[PDB]
Design a protein around this ligand. Structure first.
Ligand SMILES: CCCCCCCCO[C@@H]1O[C@H](CO)[C@@H](O)[C@H](O)[C@H]1O
Length: 22
């Protein structure tokens, strides 16, 4: 579960970063 949690957090932060950049 910690892997799943950390990976989801990271991926969502990356999506938001891309959205904010474009
Ligand atoms: C300090 C208290 C720790 C509690 C941890 C509870 C969840 C543990 O979860 C375990 O994580 C492991 C490592 O990713 C996996 O290999 C196991 O399959 C999974 O059951």
């Amino acid at each position: 579960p910690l892997v799943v949690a950390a990976s989801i957090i990271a991926i969502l932060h990356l999506i938001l970063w891309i959205l904010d950049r474009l």
